[PDB]
Design a protein around this ligand. Sequence first.
Ligand code: NA
Length: 302
Amino acid sequence: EELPDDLMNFKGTWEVSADGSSGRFFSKGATDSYVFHLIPAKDVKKPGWREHNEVKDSYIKIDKQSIAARYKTSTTAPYSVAFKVNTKSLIKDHDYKITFEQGQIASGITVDYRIGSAFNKTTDDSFKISDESKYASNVKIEGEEQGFKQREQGDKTISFRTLKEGPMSLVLLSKVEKKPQGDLDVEFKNLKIIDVTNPSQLDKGVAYVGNKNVQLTLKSDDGRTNFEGDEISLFNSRGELLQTVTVTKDQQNPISITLSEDQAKSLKNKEKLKVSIKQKQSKKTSKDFFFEVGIDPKVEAK
Ligand code: NA
């Protein structure tokens, strides 16, 4: 069976220019606004805990599978550290499922999970938590709420729909409300994201005997309007494949399928043609749809 591709872009590095690097940010006073969390320039590729440049209030650590923050006793609270773990380029108006493990959460740390813009691979990148609604709709954490809270440790699932095309990020936020009395660590690991978009459905099909042009009107029960990536297969009543087409970005109804001259000539009056739609990214396949070939209702000629 065909599995959807993992669309994470997490190579386990702070090296800003490196492909798959992750963003690192902070917010003094734990406000809506975050700026880039600088670390000593000579140490950006070094494994282990990396100090917040000069101030050393927070340390951060990344490796092939995990990303973590440490709050020191010198932290001025409230204070928040956030990471951005980038995805590959996403399709506009597709549905995605992020999974990861919430590792250790020290006593005193509260956590939030958001969707955001991708980390833009600059040391002056910035973001606002409240920018989430510019990039994603319908964000849902299974069994939990967004906003800073204490959370159970274990597997997490977050689903959302994109509002734009392009890479995005999972934003992993944590904060302390009071000054730490010892090192407080929080870890996140084993990040994955897959496309879970449902394929569109056939609303209506128009085909006439001897006519090469087939017009298929698509619909979506769950409100999708960008049918990009759906693979439409059209078959005759004998189950023989006639044509396959892939829907392009924001392609409007009706979707045209052009038959060969022999195929058009072979269509029978009232023939039940079959349509099967495969979502190429999520790998989900629709139910079989059927429609009849008709007689062109165009005006008679004499
Ligand atoms: Na929700």
